[PDB]
């Protein structure tokens, strides 16, 4: 059945994710103080004052930076800039190539004694089986240079797959929690065990002192299930009690 | 700004770390020389002999 | 978003002043809200600051802008640099500069475009946030500014507009900002814009060389009294551990020395000779640290104090009361610089077979049995003390462990981690641990003194029941050492029986989950056996008063002898292990510390 | 005497004072420097009324919106909730209404819901009018009090009001 | 300001270098301390034999 599984070209319409907050490298102040650096010998003369970054993002099938760039407005960095915007591109799902990459960069937005700060990142679209839906919610790292956590560009957050190990055990359990994996207990004992998982998140949080960030997305209409428009037998990966 | 931030950062890191370090080292090693070096011998005698 | 057209517009060229005038009507038609939407015009303005297009009329529109610009977020601060081009373009700059400098004197003086940084006075995202909340209120808001001319400076007028109220900000520290900075005209341009706002709004090893069998639970066992039917011994040395097979209740036992001692229960049921002599032996060549049967198998797994571990396959003929005898270590597992700690082995029904043992570092190490190789590792902490008991959930999902420090610790195996800890206050080293129907609650056998059991609900952390042999209802610490040291046996099934050694009285009590009041003990007493087992309450626990008629025990030796002569027939050391088996009827074995066993039916 | 146990969940926007409210009730303490909660904290405290010891098993949830998806795990089988807002923050009150709505739709129908207008010691910066909050509470059978974890105002009182309403 | 800035700034590095140094020997001492549990285990075990 595969929830009456249907193809990629059998889909039709635009997309709308959402976008949260970040854990910083802390090179200068939260919000802004005027860039903290002992090489201020010259740098002070550059009028470095308190400031505020923003960002822009487009997309590429690498070789063509295809997409429209789009910019960001304002929220206080006391929130760690936690937006939770719900963020959309009208790009019909059939209009999306299976191999393509996001491109995003820090820029600026509140008129500095400074020139608008760079800070790149890049990562891929599809999951292992090609479905973009594998990317739906995720996390990433980068600096003034450019990086990704889930699919690393070359900076802080620089390796993707084997980093999650106990966190990969958490991903395997996330697939079950998503499936409501039926072979083991999820009663109020396990509800409180999820209280323990809330605990383990914070371990990850120490490790998060590099440059991490939080990403989100999911459907409106549901029950529904889908795949690509071509075929290969990855569905042979299946299980039972 | 420099003086403040450095005063802030240094004083905190220093003073807490001084205090915690002096304590945690003091305690951990004292336990060994008071107990590793004493309880063990005491209960060896009452092991082997007994 | 789509009003970005304002930028690319300047890429179209015209020097007709008419276009610049329609642009002044467009500039009138355009002072707009979004933080980014101002920059498209900024950069059009840059084109205009390369070449000014409409002279003094332009100069006036710019003048109109400059007073509004005397209010600024730092979002506005980029435009300051752009504005330095307008004076950089010599209009005798200094006179017009002077007129405007009076009109925006936030500090008295400055110089060239970079030297524009000096004459600062404060922006405020803060009071503007309050002002956006006040997008709700206009009128009175143009009525308070002329009074603010006096209220700040002069004394021309005073205001009574409290008909509109809205005191809270003026009541708070938010009142202060107008004296310092806040002023009227910015707020009127802002009010215009606020109206615009308002308008927008499994068996791989087990079938290679092992044999197989299936488990055999008894009927409800509260009904039978037990009469001592048999007596025997492994050796004089203490029993290393006891195990009873499901097949023919094949009885496995061993001397402390590492010499095996096995028997056939059906042979005993028949020939009756079985107590005199060993049915089966094996040379281990070292002191047995632990024993556990292979689940669903005739194979038996044994570990030694050298770290060495191995699995015997049974070679036996199938002739009634007459098995051929041969021990055979079928597989081997490594000795190590880390020694052993004890284990139970688990085939998991609809799931795989694995065996788990503790290392000498305290770590659980959990080998896939089919692989005879590791599958998981869970590391215990120096702080907990050693393992004092081991237990597992019905599906093995939650491990439950009692520490040598009197703390109980659990591990989610589904998550492969220690979940957490608890430690009942007296914090004595746990004797044993087990689980009952009403699986949510669990039995802890030695923390505190005179208490027999601190049965506690796993989800709760808390001793839902507390049973004590004490004459007093609270836990008076009347226990001799052997009161805290005992065997126990419980059933999550089979009519819900529980059996309990009282090591103080060296005897087998019974406690029936069906009737705590009617709980006739299975084993006798020489003086006065009868027990008024009535449960009382003092809020916090449903305390069971085991009102044994004349028990004759307390925290000191107030009787001349009171030792091995004082037992229901069959003298012995404390019951190290007690277990039930059911080859024909249900019957029970008591294994004492003395290398000696007595059987009851 | 008898003991009645109830699971209680605290919900509301980050920094409204959920951990402060419960620390006051549980420990009789208040810290100006209280740490933002990660995930959820377990606490317990009792009240006594009508000879009944009422023991609350309290889940103090992290209010941060990333943890929204975890909230249903903590309020599943909860017999009581406190939805907390900050009286100086009208938006915290908008978020409070949306928590109350989620509870109406997705929690046990028997749930006794209390609404806390917290930080009432800062009444000179009031943004949320008492009678507006009361009107919303009355309309939805919520127990409403303005509380201050700081001063202790109405802290014990709100938990007692819950205990009284709960089936005992 | 410049002289004293340099003086004050660069010695913080040296101060904190020793703080990192503490973290190293502490890791070693933890292993040493972990052996206390090994000895305790052995004593308790054979004492449980007694
Ligand atoms: N003045 C005043 N401050 C309070 C009061 N209650 C809490 N605070 C303060 O508000 C801040 C946030 O309080 P918390 O208890 O941590 O808020 P929370 O709702 O638990 O926040 P999260 O855990 O992030 O969801 C802390 O500085 C508290 O000391 C109060 O009643 N009055
Ligand atoms: Mg909190």
Numbering used by the authors:
A (entry chain BBB): 5 to 245
B (entry chain AAA): 251 to 300
C (entry chain CCC): 611 to 701, 707 to 816, 959 to 1358
D (entry chain DDD): 16 to 183
E (entry chain EEE): 201 to 250
Task: Pull text from the paper.
VPS34 is the primordial member of the phosphoinositide 3-kinase (PI3K) family of lipid kinases, and it is present in all eukaryotic clades. It phosphorylates phosphatidylinositol (PI) to generate PI3P, which controls a range of cellular processes by reversibly recruiting specific protein effectors to membranes. PI3P is generated by two complexes that both contain the lipid kinase VPS34: complex II on endosomes (VPS34/VPS15/Beclin 1/UVRAG), and complex I on autophagosomes (VPS34/VPS15/Beclin 1/ATG14L).
In order to directly visualise the interaction with membranes, we determined the structure of complex II bound to Rab5a–GTP-decorated LUVs using cryo-ET and subtomogram averaging. To improve the membrane recruitment, we made a construct (complex II–BATS) that has the C terminus of UVRAG deleted (residues 1–464 remaining) and replaced by the BATS domain of ATG14L (residues 413–492)21,36 which can still be activated by Rab5a–GTP. A total of 26,979 subtomograms contributed to the final average resulting in a reconstruction with an overall resolution of 9.8 Å. Thus, Rab5a–GTP is located in a pocket surrounded by the VPS15 SGD and WD40 domain, the UVRAG/Beclin 1 coiled-coil, and VPS34 C2HH insertion of the C2 domain. The C2HH interacts with both switches I and II, while the VPS15 WD40 domain interacts with Rab5a outside the switches. The VPS15 SGD interacts with the surface of Rab5a opposite the switch interface. Instead, it appears that binding to Rab5a-decorated membranes releases the inhibitory contacts between VPS34 and VPS15. This indicates that the activation mechanism of VPS34 complex II by Rab5a involves both the increased recruitment of complex II by Rab5a to membranes and the release of the autoinhibition. Interestingly, only the adaptor arm is solidly attached to the membrane while the catalytic arm is poised above the membrane. The BARA domain of Beclin 1 shows a protrusion towards the membrane, which is in direct contact with the lipid bilayer.
